[PDB]
Amino acid sequence: TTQLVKEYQEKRSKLEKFMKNPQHDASLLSNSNEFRDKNVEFFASGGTRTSKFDKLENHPFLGYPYKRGVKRVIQHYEPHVEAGGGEDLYGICIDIDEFSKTATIVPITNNFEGYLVAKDSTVKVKDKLIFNKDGALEKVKATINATALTDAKQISNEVYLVKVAVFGNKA
């Protein structure tokens, strides 16, 4: 019984790691009065700078494409979006809704500035970044032009967020 409870907690933590805003119940209120470095979290949706004329598309998704590059996959049901990069990159998922399983996505034709998932912590400022097969930004044959504005910041065992500006495709 107690062992089963412990296993349930372990699997719940593993699942909640891959979540935008996992719901947790805490015994204490965490204190963060310092207004500096209060935005580097996995629940910070959207981008640092947002324009009123930005184009957003909602699509059904497979897996967890939050804060990752997404590509259209056609299977009968409507086509969905799957986390991936390479030459098949269609856009970047900037928001997610798990209840409806709907991802809000900025197309590649629109420039974006915000925090995205990085493959590792080997990314510095003024570095060319490419979306890998898993939709993560890795340091550099770049079809798109993405440059890191800050260094990779670690939150979880594998959560690496980096501020990146993506402004189209190269030639």
Binding site: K20, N21, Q23, F43, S45, D97, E98, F99
Partner: peptide
């Protein structure tokens, strides 16, 4: 709570 949306 899930979407971090608040009243104006």
């Amino acid at each position: 709570i899930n979407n971090n949306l608040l009243p104006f």
